[PDB]
Design a protein around this nucleic acid. Sequence first.
RNA 1: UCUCCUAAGAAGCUG
RNA 2: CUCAGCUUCUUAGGAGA
Lengths: 73, 60, 915, 131
Amino acid sequence: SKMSDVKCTSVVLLSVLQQLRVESSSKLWAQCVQLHNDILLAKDTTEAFEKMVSLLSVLLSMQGAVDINKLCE
Amino acid sequence: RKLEKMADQAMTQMYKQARSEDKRAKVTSAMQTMLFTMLRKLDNDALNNIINNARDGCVP
Amino acid sequence: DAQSFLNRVCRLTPCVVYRAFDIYNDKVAGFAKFLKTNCCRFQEKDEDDNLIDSYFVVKRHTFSNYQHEETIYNLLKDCPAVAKHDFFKFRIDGDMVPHISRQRLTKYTMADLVYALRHFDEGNCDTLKEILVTYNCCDDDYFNKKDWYDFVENPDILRVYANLGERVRQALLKTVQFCDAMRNAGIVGVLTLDNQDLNGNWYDFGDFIQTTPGSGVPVVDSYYSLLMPILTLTRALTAESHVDTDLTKPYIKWDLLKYDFTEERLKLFDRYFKYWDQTYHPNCVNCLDDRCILHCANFNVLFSTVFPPTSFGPLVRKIFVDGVPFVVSTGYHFRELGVVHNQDVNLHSSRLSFKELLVYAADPAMHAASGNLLLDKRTTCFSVAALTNNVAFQTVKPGNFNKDFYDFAVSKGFFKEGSSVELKHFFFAQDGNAAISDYDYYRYNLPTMCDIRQLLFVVEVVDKYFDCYDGGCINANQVIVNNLDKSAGFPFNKWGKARLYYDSMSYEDQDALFAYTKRNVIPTITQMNLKYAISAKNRARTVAGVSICSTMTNRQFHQKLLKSIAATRGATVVIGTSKFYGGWHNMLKTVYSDVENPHLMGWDYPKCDRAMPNMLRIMASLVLARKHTTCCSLSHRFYRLANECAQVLSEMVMCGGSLYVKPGGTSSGDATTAYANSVFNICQAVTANVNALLSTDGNKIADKYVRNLQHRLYECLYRNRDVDTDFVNEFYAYLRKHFSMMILSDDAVVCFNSTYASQGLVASIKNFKSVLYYQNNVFMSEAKCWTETDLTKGPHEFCSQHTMLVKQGDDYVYLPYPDPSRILGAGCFVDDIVKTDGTLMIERFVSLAIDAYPLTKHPNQEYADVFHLYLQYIRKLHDELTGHMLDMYSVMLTNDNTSRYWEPEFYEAMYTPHT
Amino acid sequence: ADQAMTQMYKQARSEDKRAKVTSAMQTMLFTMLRKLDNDALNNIINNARDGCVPLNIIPLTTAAKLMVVIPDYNTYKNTCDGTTFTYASALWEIQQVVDADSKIVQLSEISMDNSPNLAWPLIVTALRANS
RNA sequence: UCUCCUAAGAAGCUG
RNA sequence: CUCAGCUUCUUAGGAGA
Ligand SMILES: *Cc1cc(O)n2ncc(C(=O)OC)c2n1
Ligand SMILES: [Mn+2]
Ligand SMILES: [Zn+2]
Ligand SMILES: [Zn+2]
């Protein structure tokens, strides 16, 4: 369960990462693309959630890029 | 009646261009808001824990 | 008689099997596996008691044939390509009976190898494994790997096969020696693969007859023609790349400036195909017709593997314009067509007009000569130059999420747990080194020599399928350009779209350019672009943008025939036929075509564009050009073929700011890609049918008509040189009757007589697998294909559409329906942000509802719910749009004709035959 | 009368665009020929028996610069190890190295231990040695 | 009012 | 940011009834 939710959220997350100009780093963009494509092809919710956590860690690492505190109130 | 059709077409074009510009301007903030709304809906333990840690300041 | 006999045969060990024979007599004809006659085979053991690949084959013979063979052998005895024979008589029942002992033969013959490699089955390849292991190409433990035979999953199998090349080359040399001996002794006979062992020795003289010593005549048509594919498959001629043709010596170091290898080609032909009696033109500009072009291009394909890759491509020359020097292409060295020289080369030009300027801008000569040297280690494709100081890394973005539609669908009960409808189509993202990775898939294109005598008959039968169309050249004012806002290619894409060049060039200029291309070769550059589309597979797809010159001239050459094909209903090629208003039902009822025991089958080619051999692409081009028998001369048609090859077959490719060389394969993005694919598909199907019919034992065919058809088909392939029009018509009628095709590019449906297929009289899936293996260098998986025994179910899939037989009023009709996941993914994910605002894009949802309507007829309610979901969403979007218009302006939309877009009728009318 | 005026305007626009693109193509074609090496090109052209030479050897024998795209460290050590290397029967001296991000990479950084920290593929620009 | 045919723009699907 | 086919919608114009 929550398979489609996870896949849609991963799509939106990679869109946000691309908007933050992550393609300017070949390594980081390649890793993010790998995780996103893996999540889309996933058949197990646990593996997809693991890769979702891994993909969100990239977004949260660049703390100054996106304002976490404001976005969630 | 023809003038009514012309005005309707002009107003449809104006509405289309206004909506297109507004949609295309807000893209970044709208995307971030959508992302975090979807993450809130997911309500997974690991995602919530990671997000709360980042909010408090414990980032990776 | 088991002790003295063994001694007379002599270190030999004392001693039902099916072997491949090439038979042709007044009763049977073909190339099939038959039962081996009774013979005594004593295996020779080495001094260390090690059994080796040496056998003594002793067979009882009548006095007449015994004496005949003894005479012929005494004539041919001293040739070293002839196996040693021993003629003796042995006492049985008190009287002497003659025996002939063919000494030290191998276990298998050349016919066994050719049959094993041409009629390949992954479950019944014991003979092939035995051959591979015996001659040290690999070990038994190599076959424990899965897909050890697949060219794509296991590209190392090519090396294993190449380990047979030297054996095959030695067999060819010995064949030439044997033919020389036959000519010198005055012996007339037919050479067949089953009479030569895998050491290259010949051992069967029963059918030979004597003649004046100096006027012997060997017949080698079937031998060489059947052997041809194996020559390239095993890379037999590799030794010709080394000094003195020794594999232990260094490679020959050719001069870099050398490009004319005509004498080398003639030497190779005289060394390996001396007694092939048809004339060979190394440069196909001297060929007499398109059949001769195919014939000689086959040999050119074989021989071009021996020459340096740097010698092929445009031949550039320095010219002067206004006193300044240009480097321009004045010729071309094709791997298949040889050397071609432009007829209108003008030195010391006064000034450049628009046409000449366009031609020189399209040429890759200036771009390559001004660029840097490139060494790209990411790919194995030949890299020419780097046109910029930097490399470009183009990525693919993810799709945009239409969250409103997703929420609406989920609120309606979609995407639950265990439901049969799941999201499977997405926008997959790609990293920087993606386009070049896709380009690297051209490594699946290998030099494939064809069975020329089989191909020259298949081409006539394929041309029979294109007799109802009309074609020929048209003027620049008769050309129809669909969209003029498309790219003009490189370098033209940096100054405008196709509209700029179609407007700048007057009709006279376009006609002059076309006439120029009928006498000269213009090589152009193709640009590789990444596609941004929704798919169910992670693979990225690249499209080829051809230059504007190539597109213009190819349109003016082919558009008449293409439009004729697209406007014809009821033919095998269904390009141009709509699936709406009963078109799907009409196409299915047309393909059923009153076959007797109808079964349906279907297939789709793997790596279709990247793996198509150059010979079949040239054949498709020639078939398309056969419509110019009056508007064009022989040389005009040849130069059109040369331009086509130089522009869409082996042209230069722009990928990430760099120039590479395209080994081959169709360039999806040229004028005639779909129609050429259709010709190629029909050719493969006809070849499968020919191989099915000729590989069947003729003694077991209970139908006299089909046994005479087989006999005459063998005659027409390997014994008759001129085209037999009557038999081509008869075989075409036979195929139409028992093998009914529906073709759209590389997609096919077949309705076939299941009894004939079970008896081997028409092709089946295994015949297609074999043909693809030995003629296309791809292994076709049984999961790629499908078979339906119940015609009321319709074909399993065609053009990504499933079929259902539903009641529509008072009669049952076939309707196509798509994958529900595809439509739902189209709704949920878009390639543009503005497409996520529903009120601006109601028409796209109307189109998606049109596509999804037939799902309501499905017996699965989850499938049926998609159309209703789309209609409800259309209603909701219209309501929201009216509300927003009212809020933003004090108006009423007043449009009451949109109510038809959320009612079934508007969509039900799209599948009713009335229109 | 209005239609004729519109047609005349369209023809004038087409002629103006034609002149623009003609000038652009002429400028490109005359700019490209000032970059090639006259001496080497003349040498190879004169060596040719009848003027015609294959195009694929023009960059090999006359280009003054080489760009090598390396996907991994194994290929780097195989092909362009050190500050000079041999390719196409010529000697090349490395002039610069950049990563996939177009950032300069010192030759000391290209080692087995530090390979995972580099953004592959690397692009190496070298100049033909011996003049 | 209806039908057909030319052109322009938006969009969807297929190989 | 290619080739070709089919389809829906909107607008301008011509002809016929
Ligand atoms: C059984 C049999 C009979 C005869 O005459 N033969 N000639 C050659 C072979 C054979 O298979 O050797 C390769 C053979 N077998
Ligand atoms: Mn025999
Ligand atoms: Zn010829
Ligand atoms: Zn013609």
